[PDB]
Amino acid sequence: NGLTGTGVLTESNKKFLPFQQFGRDIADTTDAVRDPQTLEILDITPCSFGGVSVITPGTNTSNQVAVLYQGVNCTEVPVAIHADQLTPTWRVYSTGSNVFQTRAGCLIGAEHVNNSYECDIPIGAGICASYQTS
Amino acid sequence: QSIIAYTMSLGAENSVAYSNNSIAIPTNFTISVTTEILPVSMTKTSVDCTMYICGDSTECSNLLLQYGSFCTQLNRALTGIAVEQDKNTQEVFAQVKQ
Amino acid sequence: CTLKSFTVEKGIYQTSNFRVQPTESIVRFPNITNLCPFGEVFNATRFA
Amino acid sequence: QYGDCLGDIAARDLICAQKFNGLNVLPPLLTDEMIAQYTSALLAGTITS
Amino acid sequence: IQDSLSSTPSALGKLQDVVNQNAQALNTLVKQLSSNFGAISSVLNDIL
Ligand SMILES: *[C@@H]1O[C@H](CO)[C@@H](O[C@@H]2O[C@H](CO)[C@@H](O[C@@H]3O[C@H](CO)[C@@H](O)[C@H](O)[C@@H]3O)[C@H](O)[C@H]2NC(C)=O)[C@H](O)[C@H]1NC(C)=O
Ligand SMILES: *[C@@H]1O[C@H](CO)[C@@H](O[C@@H]2O[C@H](CO)[C@@H](O)[C@H](O)[C@H]2NC(C)=O)[C@H](O)[C@H]1NC(C)=O
Ligand SMILES: *[C@@H]1O[C@H](CO)[C@@H](O[C@@H]2O[C@H](CO)[C@@H](O)[C@H](O)[C@H]2NC(C)=O)[C@H](O)[C@H]1NC(C)=O
Ligand SMILES: *[C@@H]1O[C@H](CO)[C@@H](O)[C@H](O)[C@H]1NC(C)=O
Ligand SMILES: *[C@@H]1O[C@H](CO)[C@@H](O)[C@H](O)[C@H]1NC(C)=O
Ligand SMILES: *[C@@H]1O[C@H](CO)[C@@H](O)[C@H](O)[C@H]1NC(C)=O
Incomplete structure (x- = not known):
């Protein structure tokens, strides 16, 4: 009905009154809408995932990299980042199988060892990373 | 009960007797424990410009x-602020090596 | 790209949003049948 | 957690809203357990040595 | 000492503001997103 927006839509359960047609956020942006034809309610959600941090051991030594997804549980990382909608080079770091779960989120591109050295490249929540032995 | 306005008090006056030939010496003592609180670190944060200014357009x-x-x-x-916070915490706490 | 350099040292880095994703378009409109009578105004025999 | 924001807990309780716009809060390096361990070590050293 | 920390709540005020003020500042930022800044309307996609 002229409301122009960009984001995924989901079936909602909000308790609209019969005379209402919008829904607003704390920042006062459109959040829920009602279909003009049939009386159903939709919740919107933006598509960017402000997010991922990148860990490198320095380009002067190696080009390998690791990625930390912040505050997202990595059972649903493919869904939350839209892995199937991106280039395969991103799907490589999405899939992983070198998947570690940390309090800060989920880390991909490194292996977890029991023995504990000093800290080399800080990460957080008590976890550090480093580049070594190939 | 009502609200009242007044010139506040400077404390309790206690004059001390002074003389050129007399001294005062304690006989008993006591032990006290006091508490003081110092802030150390603030909350880290980080901002993504393309998200905030030009959201998905x-x-x-x-x-x-x-x-x-x-x-x-x-x-x-x-980034500088975020690193400085951890630096402060490490400096204040990690004082003993062993 | 974010740091605008060809060399990068150690340490964690924060990245902006640069990935490009295609997106479809959807439009929803209500039922409507009759036509607007703009011609009647435009074909008025006399203007006040 | 982001999964909490995906669902319907309190309809964007002012933390999910500030995370959908790019703003983020980051972990401290040392959790409370390590700090408590340092504190206990210092206290024990003081009372013994 | 225990009683004091269990009785005088404001004794920890020095550690409370360092939190509250922080949050307040950040909140203001989000509200500034609703501003118009002299354009037709604050919604970007709308005028787009
Ligand atoms: C220096 O000051 C201290 C602190 O007041 C004095 O110790 C106190 O001495 C009194 C009397 O000797 C104690 O009171 C007694 O308590 C017992 C119960 O334990 C009761 O049965 C007695 O009838 C009497 O009331 C008091 O408890 C004690 N203080 C503490 C913390 O134990 C000390 O005597 C003073 N020294 C000099 C040289 O004056
Ligand atoms: C990701 O989600 C799963 C399930 O939603 C979490 O798995 C459970 O986590 C709880 C922690 O409260 C454990 O007590 C259970 O044993 C876990 N069950 C299984 C089957 O794994 C998982 O912890 C979440 N990841 C986090 C929180 O980092
Ligand atoms: C006019 O709007 C009505 C809304 O109820 C449409 O009627 C129903 O639309 C749903 C769409 O989900 C169909 O499943 C039903 O079969 C429709 N029922 C009837 C009795 O039509 C209706 O289709 C709209 N008009 C047109 C021309 O599509
Ligand atoms: C790595 O650092 C050394 C330091 O002397 C420098 O000479 C070298 O050019 C750097 N590597 C690259 C690829 O520039
Ligand atoms: C750590 O110890 C556990 C305990 O048996 C073991 O299952 C695991 O494989 C060990 N991991 C490493 C990296 O040594
Ligand atoms: C009425 O307006 C329409 C314009 O679309 C056109 O048919 C004509 O200009 C006018 N007169 C008649 C007789 O249609």
Whole structure:
């Protein structure tokens, strides 16, 4: 009905009154809408995932990299980042199988060892990373 | 019960007797424990410019990329603050090696 | 790209949003049948 | 957690809203357990040595 | 000492503001997103 927006839509359960047609956020942006034809309610959600941090051991030594997804549980990382909608080079770091779960989120591109050295490249929540032995 | 306005008090006056030939010496003592509180670290934070300013729109990002080296500077500043916080905590607490 | 350099040292880095994703378009409109009578105004025999 | 924001807990309780716009809060390096361990070590050293 | 920390709540005020003020500042930022800044309307996609 002229409301122009960009984001995924989901079936909602909000308790609209019969005379209402919008829904607003704390920042006062459109959040829920009602279909003009049939009386159903939709919740919107933006598509960017402000997010991922990148860990490198320095380009002067190696080009390998690791990625930390912040505050997202990595059972649903493919869904939350839209892995199937991106280039395969991103799907490589999405899939992983070198998947570690940390309090800060989920880390991909490194292996977890029991023995504990000093800290080399800080990460957080008590976890550090480093580049070594190939 | 009501609200009242007044000139506040400076404390309790207690004059001390002074003389050129007399001294005062204690006989008993006591032990006290006092508490003081010091802040150390503040909350880290980080901002993504393309998300905040030009949220998921192609035209806005295209116009923004010509401005360029603004949110890079912001990222550098916030990174400095974030690292400095951990530096403060490590300095104040990790004092003993063993 | 974010740091605008060809060299990068150690340490964690924060990245902006640069990935490009295609997106479809959807439009929803209500039922409507009759036509607007703009011609009647435009074909008025006399203007006040 | 982001999964909490995906669902319907309190309809964007002012933390999910500030995370959907790019703003983020980052972990401290040392959790409370390590700090408590340092504190206990210092206290024990003081009372013994 | 225990009683004091269990009785005088404001004794920890020095550690409370360092939180509250922080949050307040950040909140203001989000509200500034609703500003118009001299354009037709604050919604970007709308005028787009
Ligand atoms: C220096 O000051 C201290 C602190 O007041 C004096 O110790 C106190 O001495 C009195 C009397 O000797 C104690 O009171 C007694 O308590 C017992 C119960 O334990 C009761 O049965 C007695 O009838 C009497 O009331 C008091 O408890 C004690 N203080 C503490 C903390 O134990 C000390 O005597 C003073 N020294 C000099 C040289 O004056
Ligand atoms: C990701 O989600 C799963 C399930 O939603 C979490 O798995 C459970 O986590 C709880 C922690 O409260 C454990 O007590 C259970 O044993 C876990 N069950 C299984 C089957 O794994 C998982 O912890 C979440 N990841 C986090 C929180 O990092
Ligand atoms: C006019 O709007 C009505 C809304 O109820 C449409 O009627 C129903 O639309 C749903 C769409 O989900 C169909 O499943 C039903 O079969 C429709 N029922 C009837 C009795 O039509 C209706 O289709 C709209 N008009 C047109 C021309 O599509
Ligand atoms: C790595 O650092 C050394 C330091 O002397 C420098 O000479 C070298 O050029 C750097 N590597 C590259 C690829 O520039
Ligand atoms: C750590 O110890 C556990 C305990 O048996 C073991 O299952 C695991 O494989 C060990 N991991 C490493 C990296 O040594
Ligand atoms: C009425 O307006 C329409 C314009 O679309 C056109 O048919 C004509 O200009 C006018 N007169 C008649 C007789 O249609």
